[PDB]
Amino acid sequence: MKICKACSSCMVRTYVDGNIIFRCSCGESVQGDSQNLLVSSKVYHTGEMEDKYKIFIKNAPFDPTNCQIKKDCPNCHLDYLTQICIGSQKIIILVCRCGYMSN
Amino acid sequence: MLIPVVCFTCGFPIGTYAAIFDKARTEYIKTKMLDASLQIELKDLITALGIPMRVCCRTHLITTLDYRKYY
Amino acid sequence: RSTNKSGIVRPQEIFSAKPVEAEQSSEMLLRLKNPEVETNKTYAQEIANSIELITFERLILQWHLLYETYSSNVMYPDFASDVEWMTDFLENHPLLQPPEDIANWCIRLELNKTTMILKSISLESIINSLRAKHPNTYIMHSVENTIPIIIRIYLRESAFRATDEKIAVNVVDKLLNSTIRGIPGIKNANVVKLMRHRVDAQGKLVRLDNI
Amino acid sequence: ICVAQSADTGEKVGMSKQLAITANVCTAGEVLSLKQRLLSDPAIQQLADVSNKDIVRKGLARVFINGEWIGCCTNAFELAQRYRMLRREGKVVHPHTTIYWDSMVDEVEFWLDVGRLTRPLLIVDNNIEKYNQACYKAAEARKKGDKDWEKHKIPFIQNTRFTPQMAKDILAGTLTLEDLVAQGICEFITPEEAENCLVAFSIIELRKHKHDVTRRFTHVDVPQAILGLAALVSPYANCTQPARVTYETNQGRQTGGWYCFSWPYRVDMNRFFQFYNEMPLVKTIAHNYVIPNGLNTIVAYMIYGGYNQEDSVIVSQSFIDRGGFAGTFYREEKVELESDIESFG
Amino acid sequence: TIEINSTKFSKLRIPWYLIFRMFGMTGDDSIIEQVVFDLESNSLVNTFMIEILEKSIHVLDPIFQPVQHELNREKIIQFLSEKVLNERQLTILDKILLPHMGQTADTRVRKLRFLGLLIHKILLVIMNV
Amino acid sequence: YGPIETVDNEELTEADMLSFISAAVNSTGLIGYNIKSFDDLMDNGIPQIVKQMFNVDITYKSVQIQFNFTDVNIERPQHRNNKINLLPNKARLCGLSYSGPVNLAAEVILTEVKRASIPPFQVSTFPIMRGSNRCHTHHLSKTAKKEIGEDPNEPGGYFIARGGEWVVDLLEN
Amino acid sequence: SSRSGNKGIAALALPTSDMPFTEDGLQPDLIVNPHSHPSRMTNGQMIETTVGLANALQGVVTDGTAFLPINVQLLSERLAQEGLRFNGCQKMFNGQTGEYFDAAIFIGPTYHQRLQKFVLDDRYAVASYGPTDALTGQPLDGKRSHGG
Amino acid sequence: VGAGSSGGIYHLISRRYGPQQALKMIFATQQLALNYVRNAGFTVSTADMLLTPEAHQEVQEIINELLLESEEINNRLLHGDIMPPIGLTTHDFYEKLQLNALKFPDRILKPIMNSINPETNGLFQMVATGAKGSNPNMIHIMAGIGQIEINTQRIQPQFSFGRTLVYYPRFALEAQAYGFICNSYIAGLTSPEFIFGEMNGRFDLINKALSTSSTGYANRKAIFGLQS
RNA sequence: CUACACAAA
DNA sequence: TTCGCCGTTGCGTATTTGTGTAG
DNA sequence: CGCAACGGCGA
Ligand SMILES: [Zn+2]
Ligand SMILES: [Zn+2]
Ligand SMILES: [Zn+2]
């Protein structure tokens, strides 16, 4: 996001002609270089699960409806660990209430 | 609305002892103490009434609802 | 049942005379030539792999559409360690010079090596398919004999006669949809065991279970 | 919702649902009192004090009451648990309020609106705090090098406070569901709150996992609670194909019987009053609350001349004559006089 | 597009940022923040959210062309009144826009926070999370 | 609460939990949700709907009219023979509606001001659920219901309108 | 119909002398085809008959509520302890001929319901004349209109 | 002699002497059979569908081996050893593995038939002679229901995120959580097993309810396209 | 006759 | 200039039976 | 609810 410094609004990209001109509705421009040259991108199945389920994975040990298994928490030394099976690839995450988050 | 005059299945006259059975059963349940009352065995009571060991006759004797108990 | 064959969908396709593009359960049964060789499962599996359609999007780990141009130049800071293989490509291909009218656009594609090996596809095959199908682009590639393969596609000038962003995005879409291998319209191609009858030299009609 | 009761034919299959036997419909609660209590809670930060940046930077949890966002709390789970305990006490929070905690978006939702389905569920308590304390003690023993660290661990206990004495008192009329709720033995759970509940389907299952620390039930159910009144008429319904239980729910409601107890004072149309009714020899709990319609016919499962094939039945003419399923059908003829023009004669 | 299915308003898909503008908080970055909850935050969640919000802002509305880039509340509110007295429209808007949030002038920033939360939830469902 | 380790339950059978089912059904009453909802309606909701939501204040061309209803009361159903009570069986037989009178008192303000107060009056009749707090059989023994031609073993929950009995459904929303 | 959902239409009514009877004189009220069971899986009715056979002899009414613990082996042993066979089957004689069946017949009390579908209400027969529609000139619709 | 039996005796009688003769022969043979059963007698009893304790233990062992294979698949999932084929996700491959693992072996009939006397079992004789019922009917009644499949897949987690029912925890791995019924009808299903069976039965009822309208519209269109 | 509701196969 | 698109309209969504209720 | 003309305006 390129926020106009005068009116606090989104600026268009307007790649005219050989460079990048951050044209705004009010008229102010910043131009900019380097990072602002990535027009678009798409990344195929790289970075998921933990990022979008961060809240749920944090809350999992405290949800009583989550499954538990009988194995030790190395950090915490309980006998039980909360088991999560998230996504279409069925990633198994063992998480403890102390903070253990076996990846 | 009452215990039938004769057994619906074979025609044995259980209505002869219908009233005696009703009141004797109320008495016999009272000394034996809604669901626990139904599980009290009435084999001896019905046999003493003279009714034979017939599945149909005892069925219709003990299961028929009395309208006077509901209205 | 399961390729939507649930309900009246296939009978509705049949009875309503639905067009080929409106079918949800299209299938073909293809026999190998030389009925002496249609008895080896490995050869049939190789042919099945060879005919299944593969587009460019299935070999791409990720792609980036950059405004940067190249000169035989301003470059994106993130993909700055690419100049080594750009120099290597330029020195190893003295016949494919950068366009004298190259446009200020680029497409940096990261190739999935695991998918490429799992499909027996080579970098040369991909580049040859891209150049033939998309003449008004200038493909630049890293070295396959290694860090992942990087491909840079620069629109020449002719893709533009809509803002240049829109033309570049549609060119990205066209490149990602370009078929690398296989015949169009073939999602999958699995090998099936066929029961067929055949007459021998003795004139007996035998049921061949091993087709 | 009764998982069995539905139409067995036509477009009305699964269209008209039936309340389960213990299911109730909530009335509107004191939303304003709970809102005042929440906004006076030191644990809840007001909407005008915390910004959207603080909600994600500090991991604040949005608190809703009747769908209205009223603030944020430091930790959603503790707030929901504290208010669940307050509801269990029953004084400050009405027992019929819904306290829901969404673990996927970190939100606590309170619901007190009309139309919520509720059912009472027996609460299952455990010693998980003491279990964890024993685990930490055993870990400390292992760190110290003790060769008998196992004796520090205590077995896990999970159980309900419902006891057979309370069952006897319930059957004896001394104990009621209100006393069960006030004592904290059971609580009302709404389908939204039910998503926060891990329920043992039976006391048998609760007893099976009594010492299982990996199955920590929040409630224990009574399996008959998943059926409606008409579905419970069917005996040994779990031994019957469930579609036939649906068939019975349909047929159990067209059965002739004492359609009304005040029939002689009613001019009813197309109403059938069957004289003789019997309690089933094998009754179900549905007959504690509704009158049984039908008779305990003696049935021979046999081939007799091929007159009972393809759902036909051979009946005893004598059983018909004696009054078996006999009754009175009633019709009515209501004719208005319109105005002074018409008269009866 | 945010549509209010009230009596006076119907079939009129006001852009979300325009509705945010009519209730104050003219800062467009602040309007985006009302949906993403953290403007200067990493992770692929906020980036995808913000890119969608960019596209939603930078699209020609076929029926809200004049006020699409307008930055004062007056012109947008007057356009809304034409399409459907400034303080009359803005007061009749809060009686139909999230009444459970409140119907008074004070409850407007919280109404916008709730609207941004709703848009955030919808766009989260768009992620297939 | 005591501890969970010392709860004696090993002799709690599956037929003992049917007692919990019985406790639940006896508490609700198997019909009680909708009778309670109707009682809540004509105890608080109808007064809420009338006292609130109706304090109209409009200005016409200029002239302004303001009037609100301050008191609302619904009575048990009545009949014309000196306002004799309408029993459910009489309504069913005669084809009447088992509707209870609604009484309203309204004060008009015009603005000069003219504070006019209207005495309480019958505004309409509201249909009455059988067994509701405004039904004539609400607090009645089974015998007392029998002498008035009523079913003693039925819980009510329905409406008598033009002689027929009607069930207002539980709509899914 | 029974409480397990097994609908049936009364096809034949037999006098008391024509109905089959057990060795001890028990005869049915209804004769239900065994072919109604195997596809419909209404084992609850079968178990209810087995339980009610012993209930009638003991003079009790027991609870057959769903999901209560059930042991069909113990119920059959209860039948045996009551003085009957392990199965509820008995030696039956044909009422019309007096000849015993070679197979023991399962007979017992099964609670049955009379569904309020009366053939006297459902049957309809119309002759060549009656009320017709004014517009189409066709007969009116159905029994209610006295033609159709 | 069955109805709709191509090449049966009545079809041959019709081919050689006419369909009216076939109808008369159907009536005559039906009278012969009914008059025979007038003396032979036929019945079905609750004991006809009861397994011996040994057969019950054998069925329990078969079901335990099925659940053991399912638990092995779950253990493989925990270790990340589930590697789907191309075109299949790990979730879909795991579901296929669980569906195949929980299938009843064809030897489930051995305990059923060890408890059955084929000469006197009315239920078995109805099934085996083609009069009524099928082998799955006998297996469901006596041995066990097995896995409940709706649209050729297990019970989907519809209750909540990763939950099939309020009785099973989130992301449960046991087969029972997704519609595997270890009980038979004679043994009596538990509450969640009955819920899954009710799901299946309701699905069948809905299918029967809506197929009528779809097929009726198709039939009318075909009739009007073909009637000329 | 036009809704609508409850049912049957 | 010849086609896609897109609201925008219509059409249609098993059969035969009963009973009500009202307008 | 879906399906299919359609006919008027963008290409
Ligand atoms: Zn600007
Ligand atoms: Zn830990
Ligand atoms: Zn008898």
Side-chain angles (χ1 to χ4, degrees):
Chain A
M1 227 201 322
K2 180 65 45 217
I3 285 323
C4 180
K5 281 187 246 132
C7 73
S8 151
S9 295
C10 316
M11 299 175 141
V12 197
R13 275 283 251 274
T14 75
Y15 315 87
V16 190
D17 43 20
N19 46 347
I20 35 167
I21 293 328
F22 264 126
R23 179 69 39 78
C24 180
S25 57
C26 72
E28 181 130 29
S29 310
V30 152
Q31 184 212 3
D33 286 306
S34 78
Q35 154 67 13
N36 284 158
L37 291 151
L38 187 131
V39 175
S40 186
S41 68
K42 163 134 182 132
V43 164
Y44 296 81
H45 52 267
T46 302
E48 226 201 342
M49 287 324 75
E50 220 291 312
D51 65 343
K52 65 194 250 185
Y53 296 117
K54 219 208 54 62
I55 283 179
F56 171 71
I57 288 160
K58 181 198 45 91
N59 291 327
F62 309 94
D63 197 10
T65 88
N66 273 122
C67 207
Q68 327 258 324
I69 66 178
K70 204 39 154 23
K71 68 174 298 273
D72 318 312
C73 162
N75 159 355
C76 167
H77 310 123
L78 288 177
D79 321 75
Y80 57 94
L81 279 183
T82 301
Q83 208 194 236
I84 315 168
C85 201
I86 27 188
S88 90
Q89 48 225 285
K90 296 198 101 103
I91 304 297
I92 289 290
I93 308 193
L94 320 172
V95 61
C96 185
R97 51 199 325 113
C98 70
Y100 180 65
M101 204 284 244
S102 147
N103 301 262
Chain B
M1 291 184 249
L2 298 161
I3 287 155
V5 170
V6 291
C7 161
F8 286 132
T9 290
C10 72
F12 186 88
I14 48 160
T16 326
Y17 329 101
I20 299 160
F21 171 71
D22 199 356
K23 323 278 181 283
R25 176 187 48 184
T26 292
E27 280 340 294
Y28 172 95
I29 287 169
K30 235 147 50 175
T31 86
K32 275 280 162 323
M33 320 315 270
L34 183 272
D35 264 40
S37 61
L38 283 154
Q39 329 261 342
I40 311 271
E41 281 182 32
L42 309 177
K43 211 214 289 273
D44 296 336
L45 223 71
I46 299 156
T47 315
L49 260 187
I51 286 129
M53 203 79 15
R54 300 173 74 77
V55 166
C56 52
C57 297
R58 316 217 154 187
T59 300
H60 298 309
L61 188 70
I62 81 188
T63 47
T64 319
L65 305 171
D66 201 348
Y67 206 76
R68 305 170 292 198
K69 304 218 239 264
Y70 290 99
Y71 200 65
Chain C
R1 302 192 291 280
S2 176
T3 70
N4 198 6
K5 267 125 83 150
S6 64
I8 286 306
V9 163
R10 182 53 172 143
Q12 246 173 292
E13 279 162 28
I14 292 153
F15 296 141
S16 57
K18 274 178 189 153
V20 200
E21 57 270 13
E23 317 204 351
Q24 287 136 69
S25 32
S26 279
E27 268 134 30
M28 285 182 318
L29 182 76
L30 311 170
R31 307 273 311 272
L32 326 162
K33 76 220 190 331
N34 312 342
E36 57 98 3
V37 60
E38 63 183 358
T39 45
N40 194 24
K41 201 202 77 54
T42 44
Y43 174 69
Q45 186 50 68
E46 198 270 303
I47 301 292
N49 302 0
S50 87
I51 70 155
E52 152 160 2
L53 163 77
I54 288 148
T55 164
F56 196 28
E57 200 180 29
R58 311 218 46 249
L59 321 157
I60 291 326
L61 261 177
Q62 80 210 20
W63 60 265
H64 303 263
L65 166 63
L66 330 171
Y67 202 58
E68 59 186 29
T69 199
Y70 202 48
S71 288
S72 173
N73 42 277
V74 183
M75 285 249 292
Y76 203 81
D78 225 300
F79 316 116
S81 94
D82 273 346
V83 197
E84 302 98 83
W85 72 257
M86 266 97 55
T87 42
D88 304 331
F89 168 88
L90 255 205
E91 71 141 84
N92 285 271
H93 302 252
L95 182 290
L96 319 157
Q97 271 89 315
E100 69 271 78
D101 69 321
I102 193 179
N104 231 310
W105 290 100
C106 185
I107 302 169
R108 201 237 189 210
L109 312 102
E110 160 134 38
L111 271 274
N112 199 352
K113 269 178 310 224
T114 278
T115 295
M116 290 211 349
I117 275 75
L118 164 155
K119 304 211 152 325
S120 317
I121 308 206
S122 69
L123 192 46
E124 163 146 347
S125 163
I126 305 179
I127 273 49
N128 291 342
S129 82
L130 296 200
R131 305 233 200 71
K133 279 209 185 70
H134 304 297
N136 57 350
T137 82
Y138 167 65
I139 321 287
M140 176 159 333
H141 75 89
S142 137
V143 295
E144 54 272 69
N145 48 331
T146 278
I147 62 107
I149 293 111
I150 317 303
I151 301 186
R152 268 147 171 288
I153 298 170
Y154 305 83
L155 298 79
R156 261 212 154 267
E157 242 289 16
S158 147
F160 322 97
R161 192 73 247 202
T163 199
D164 313 41
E165 214 167 34
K166 199 214 254 293
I167 310 267
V169 168
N170 315 356
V171 167
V172 152
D173 176 14
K174 252 58 100 184
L175 275 162
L176 288 181
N177 279 14
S178 95
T179 85
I180 300 321
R181 208 185 28 181
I183 47 192
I186 317 287
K187 281 97 73 203
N188 313 347
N190 328 295
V191 166
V192 298
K193 215 185 226 323
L194 273 203
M195 251 165 297
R196 287 293 177 282
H197 281 96
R198 192 171 285 146
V199 192
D200 342 338
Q202 282 112 324
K204 216 180 102 48
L205 190 68
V206 299
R207 212 249 302 266
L208 300 166
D209 273 288
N210 66 349
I211 298 290
Chain D
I1 306 283
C2 181
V3 289
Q5 169 140 1
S6 144
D8 37 31
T9 41
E11 65 281 41
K12 301 222 211 113
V13 167
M15 275 315 260
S16 271
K17 292 165 244 303
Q18 174 88 181
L19 287 193
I21 189 57
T22 59
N24 207 32
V25 183
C26 280
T27 40
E30 283 168 286
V31 57
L32 254 76
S33 325
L34 187 55
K35 209 156 124 180
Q36 267 171 12
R37 171 153 333 260
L38 289 165
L39 295 181
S40 319
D41 211 283
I44 280 183
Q45 280 115 47
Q46 264 296 36
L47 257 195
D49 305 318
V50 299
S51 47
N52 288 333
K53 196 145 305 151
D54 316 342
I55 297 162
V56 300
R57 263 73 173 310
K58 328 183 86 139
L60 294 192
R62 320 188 145 84
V63 175
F64 298 74
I65 178 140
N66 265 8
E68 156 209 31
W69 181 17
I70 55 103
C72 293
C73 54
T74 333
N75 174 250
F77 175 73
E78 301 150 40
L79 184 103
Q81 210 71 336
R82 185 159 47 82
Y83 272 79
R84 266 156 186 157
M85 290 319 109
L86 292 186
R87 192 190 52 191
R88 201 163 305 184
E89 254 162 4
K91 317 300 217 293
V92 278
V93 195
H94 191 250
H96 278 271
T97 193
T98 290
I99 299 143
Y100 171 62
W101 165 52
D102 198 333
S103 37
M104 275 258 297
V105 283
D106 230 15
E107 280 169 10
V108 195
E109 289 177 351
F110 296 87
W111 291 98
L112 309 96
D113 52 335
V114 49
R116 267 167 316 125
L117 285 187
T118 25
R119 72 189 188 118
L121 272 165
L122 292 163
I123 296 157
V124 165
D125 206 349
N126 48 40
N127 66 344
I128 198 50
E129 262 53 80
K130 320 287 262 320
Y131 184 85
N132 297 348
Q133 288 331 290
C135 299
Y136 301 155
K137 269 217 326 172
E140 284 134 20
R142 271 252 320 281
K143 281 339 162 198
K144 295 196 213 353
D146 270 89
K147 283 87 46 194
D148 58 5
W149 44 298
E150 313 286 53
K151 67 103 197 202
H152 271 338
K153 291 201 220 272
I154 72 189
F156 175 72
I157 300 308
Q158 73 176 335
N159 205 349
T160 179
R161 314 209 177 274
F162 199 64
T163 62
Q165 194 41 55
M166 314 183 15
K168 289 186 220 118
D169 310 326
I170 286 171
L171 291 182
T174 294
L175 197 63
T176 58
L177 191 74
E178 297 85 284
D179 317 338
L180 292 176
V181 168
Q183 278 153 30
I185 313 303
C186 80
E187 63 188 350
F188 296 102
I189 306 294
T190 291
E192 37 249 73
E193 173 145 36
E195 314 207 333
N196 296 162
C197 302
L198 181 55
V199 178
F201 66 87
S202 191
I203 198 75
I204 293 325
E205 172 85 338
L206 179 63
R207 210 178 286 136
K208 183 143 143 282
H209 305 260
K210 164 176 245 264
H211 308 284
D212 190 16
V213 85
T214 93
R215 274 288 154 75
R216 301 204 292 282
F217 301 109
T218 62
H219 299 89
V220 57
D221 209 352
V222 186
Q224 291 84 8
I226 69 153
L227 292 181
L229 193 68
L232 286 161
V233 169
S234 206
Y236 308 109
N238 50 318
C239 302
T240 301
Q241 170 171 279
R244 311 307 305 200
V245 186
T246 296
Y247 274 73
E248 153 68 8
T249 64
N250 280 289
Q251 300 159 191
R253 295 181 292 111
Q254 330 170 339
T255 295
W258 304 338
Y259 77 93
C260 209
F261 275 104
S262 96
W263 51 281
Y265 317 101
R266 311 178 43 112
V267 185
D268 269 311
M269 165 96 204
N270 296 333
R271 291 277 82 72
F272 176 70
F273 177 80
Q274 168 180 306
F275 298 138
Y276 291 107
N277 272 27
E278 288 190 37
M279 179 66 69
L281 261 183
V282 193
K283 64 163 285 172
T284 80
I285 202 181
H287 304 299
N288 299 352
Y289 315 106
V290 86
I291 193 80
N293 322 279
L295 292 166
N296 283 288
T297 60
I298 304 290
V299 175
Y301 300 87
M302 69 183 308
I303 298 180
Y304 202 70
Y307 278 91
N308 40 351
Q309 327 198 37
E310 293 250 55
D311 301 298
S312 293
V313 177
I314 304 166
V315 201
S316 187
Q317 180 60 246
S318 302
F319 169 80
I320 294 161
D321 288 337
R322 297 193 238 274
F325 298 126
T328 323
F329 191 72
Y330 286 111
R331 274 198 249 254
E332 82 165 346
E333 202 70 65
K334 180 153 138 164
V335 35
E336 316 286 298
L337 261 202
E338 270 75 14
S339 177
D340 56 355
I341 169 182
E342 266 137 22
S343 96
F344 288 134
Chain E
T1 81
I2 304 186
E3 189 212 324
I4 291 130
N5 208 326
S6 87
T7 74
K8 287 105 198 159
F9 302 66
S10 203
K11 323 289 202 48
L12 194 98
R13 282 108 156 290
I14 316 105
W16 68 286
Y17 56 92
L18 281 194
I19 286 185
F20 276 62
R21 282 204 198 115
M22 308 159 84
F23 278 11
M25 74 160 329
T26 51
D28 222 302
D29 63 318
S30 294
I31 299 177
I32 302 298
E33 158 104 346
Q34 288 317 309
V35 175
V36 294
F37 309 149
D38 202 12
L39 221 33
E40 277 79 15
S41 160
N42 300 335
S43 83
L44 287 152
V45 166
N46 266 195
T47 70
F48 146 95
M49 198 136 279
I50 289 193
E51 274 134 26
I52 279 184
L53 296 176
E54 307 247 350
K55 211 151 152 203
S56 62
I57 295 184
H58 298 314
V59 281
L60 299 323
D61 197 344
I63 73 198
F64 282 63
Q65 267 314 12
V67 296
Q68 159 134 15
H69 300 85
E70 171 90 38
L71 244 195
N72 77 31
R73 312 148 88 272
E74 318 283 61
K75 212 310 163 193
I76 315 170
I77 295 156
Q78 278 32 84
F79 183 163
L80 189 98
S81 36
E82 316 187 8
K83 228 54 155 192
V84 186
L85 194 45
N86 192 301
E87 98 275 332
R88 163 72 183 289
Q89 252 306 325
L90 191 157
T91 307
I92 206 170
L93 212 63
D94 90 4
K95 277 173 191 333
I96 79 195
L97 188 44
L98 306 175
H100 84 283
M101 274 288 82
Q103 325 229 4
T104 206
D106 159 10
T107 78
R108 242 177 254 160
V109 47
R110 71 175 29 100
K111 290 228 242 205
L112 285 175
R113 287 181 89 167
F114 194 85
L115 203 45
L117 182 64
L118 295 190
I119 300 184
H120 180 99
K121 286 191 223 250
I122 293 155
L123 291 195
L124 269 194
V125 178
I126 279 307
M127 243 181 196
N128 281 115
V129 49
Chain F
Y1 308 95
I4 205 61
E5 308 93 299
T6 74
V7 171
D8 217 2
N9 276 342
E10 283 301 353
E11 81 298 326
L12 191 63
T13 63
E14 275 257 68
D16 294 357
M17 324 294 303
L18 290 168
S19 78
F20 176 79
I21 295 276
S22 309
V25 173
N26 290 335
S27 140
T28 75
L30 197 72
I31 216 58
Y33 57 88
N34 63 9
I35 273 168
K36 254 186 41 62
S37 97
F38 197 70
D39 290 14
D40 186 350
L41 167 61
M42 290 166 27
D43 265 329
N44 319 300
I46 282 299
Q48 165 93 240
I49 290 154
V50 157
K51 305 174 175 234
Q52 284 77 297
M53 284 171 246
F54 285 149
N55 321 72
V56 61
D57 196 19
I58 45 71
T59 316
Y60 201 67
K61 296 230 157 204
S62 144
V63 67
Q64 190 235 42
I65 287 139
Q66 200 259 48
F67 58 95
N68 84 309
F69 305 83
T70 50
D71 177 332
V72 55
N73 193 25
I74 292 145
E75 333 276 337
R76 317 211 148 163
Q78 313 271 67
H79 189 38
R80 304 292 280 284
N81 248 354
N82 208 335
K83 265 78 176 82
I84 165 159
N85 286 358
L86 176 54
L87 294 190
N89 214 285
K90 162 86 170 178
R92 267 189 297 252
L93 289 194
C94 287
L96 326 167
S97 293
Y98 195 60
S99 317
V102 191
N103 307 317
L104 272 182
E107 282 85 335
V108 193
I109 328 289
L110 314 95
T111 284
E112 78 284 23
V113 82
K114 285 255 164 286
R115 305 275 201 121
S117 149
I118 281 84
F121 72 103
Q122 162 135 297
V123 56
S124 100
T125 35
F126 203 95
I128 306 286
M129 185 162 303
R130 253 282 278 129
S132 34
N133 51 5
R134 310 274 199 283
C135 189
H136 287 296
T137 83
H138 171 50
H139 271 325
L140 272 198
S141 41
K142 318 209 109 165
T143 85
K145 296 208 226 80
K146 286 186 324 164
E147 333 185 283
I148 62 138
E150 228 57 36
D151 193 316
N153 298 319
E154 90 170 348
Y158 59 94
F159 294 86
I160 294 125
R162 277 217 254 141
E165 307 165 295
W166 297 87
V167 173
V168 180
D169 293 320
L170 293 160
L171 262 206
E172 255 206 351
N173 309 114
Chain G
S1 147
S2 75
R3 279 179 305 159
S4 290
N6 264 105
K7 268 173 302 312
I9 287 277
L12 180 66
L14 288 172
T16 213
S17 39
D18 292 357
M19 292 272 297
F21 56 103
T22 77
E23 154 166 45
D24 58 306
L26 181 72
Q27 60 178 32
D29 305 350
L30 317 171
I31 303 185
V32 157
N33 207 223
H35 293 83
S36 46
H37 184 273
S39 53
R40 300 197 229 283
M41 263 150 208
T42 44
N43 325 107
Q45 161 179 4
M46 291 297 329
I47 298 162
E48 174 219 12
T49 300
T50 279
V51 176
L53 260 172
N55 282 7
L57 291 195
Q58 285 163 357
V60 296
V61 170
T62 48
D63 218 55
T65 323
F67 310 110
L68 280 182
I70 167 161
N71 205 335
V72 182
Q73 169 81 34
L74 270 310
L75 304 166
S76 296
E77 290 168 21
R78 174 177 182 242
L79 275 195
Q81 290 168 25
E82 269 325 292
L84 315 151
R85 298 185 198 197
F86 182 83
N87 46 17
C89 300
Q90 299 178 52
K91 186 209 313 292
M92 209 144 306
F93 300 81
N94 189 7
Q96 303 166 343
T97 56
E99 320 180 346
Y100 56 94
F101 302 100
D102 275 337
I105 301 298
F106 189 60
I107 177 167
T110 309
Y111 199 82
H112 265 255
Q113 330 163 300
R114 190 223 183 124
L115 311 190
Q116 291 175 55
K117 296 275 319 167
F118 310 97
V119 61
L120 287 160
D121 291 6
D122 303 359
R123 67 152 183 196
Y124 183 53
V126 73
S128 51
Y129 58 85
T132 64
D133 199 336
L135 173 54
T136 53
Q138 265 163 218
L140 282 192
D141 277 50
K143 186 157 92 109
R144 207 148 72 180
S145 314
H146 296 115
Chain H
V1 306
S5 174
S6 269
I9 67 156
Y10 306 125
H11 197 197
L12 310 164
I13 287 164
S14 159
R15 289 298 293 162
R16 295 208 36 201
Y17 306 99
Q20 180 63 53
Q21 218 60 50
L23 297 185
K24 190 45 184 92
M25 263 308 110
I26 290 172
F27 180 78
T29 308
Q30 162 189 151
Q31 290 319 302
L32 272 202
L34 295 174
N35 292 336
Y36 180 83
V37 187
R38 225 172 283 282
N39 269 95
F42 191 72
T43 202
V44 64
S45 166
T46 325
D48 276 354
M49 53 199 66
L50 186 64
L51 292 179
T52 61
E54 312 98 73
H56 191 106
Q57 266 323 102
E58 199 159 6
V59 167
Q60 256 295 131
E61 278 146 30
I62 291 174
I63 284 171
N64 285 341
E65 107 175 296
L66 294 184
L67 289 175
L68 209 76
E69 176 62 272
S70 167
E71 259 146 2
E72 298 279 12
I73 302 181
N74 286 334
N75 282 323
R76 274 170 53 206
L77 181 89
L78 294 204
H79 294 346
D81 289 355
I82 300 292
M83 314 301 337
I86 177 156
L88 264 196
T89 88
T90 312
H91 169 78
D92 291 317
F93 186 55
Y94 170 85
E95 281 280 294
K96 274 262 155 63
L97 287 193
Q98 290 288 342
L99 272 175
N100 311 339
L102 301 160
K103 227 156 281 306
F104 271 30
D106 263 42
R107 74 202 191 78
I108 194 62
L109 258 165
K110 161 142 181 333
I112 291 185
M113 300 277 315
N114 288 358
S115 282
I116 264 179
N117 189 357
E119 283 231 295
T120 53
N121 216 268
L123 173 78
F124 173 79
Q125 277 172 350
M126 280 186 277
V127 167
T129 61
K132 189 67 75 173
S134 68
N135 279 329
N137 291 173
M138 269 176 6
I139 293 152
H140 286 14
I141 288 166
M142 315 186 40
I145 312 296
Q147 171 70 42
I148 288 282
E149 263 161 305
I150 303 187
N151 288 122
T152 41
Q153 57 192 350
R154 303 193 298 169
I155 295 302
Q156 293 304 93
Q158 229 60 61
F159 176 73
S160 174
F161 171 53
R163 293 189 81 185
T164 42
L165 275 182
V166 72
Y167 307 116
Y168 298 108
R170 192 171 263 127
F171 308 121
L173 278 196
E174 73 250 42
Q176 289 110 314
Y178 303 94
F180 183 73
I181 307 183
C182 327
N183 276 307
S184 49
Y185 282 136
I186 272 294
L189 323 185
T190 72
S191 210
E193 296 180 344
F194 187 86
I195 289 156
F196 293 140
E198 257 302 335
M199 276 155 168
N200 191 243
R202 182 74 57 80
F203 184 78
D204 296 348
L205 295 175
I206 297 156
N207 255 43
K208 293 165 171 129
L210 313 181
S211 89
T212 60
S213 83
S214 256
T215 314
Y217 189 33
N219 178 39
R220 173 154 206 283
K221 280 192 283 151
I223 289 269
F224 269 87
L226 276 153
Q227 52 150 247
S228 274

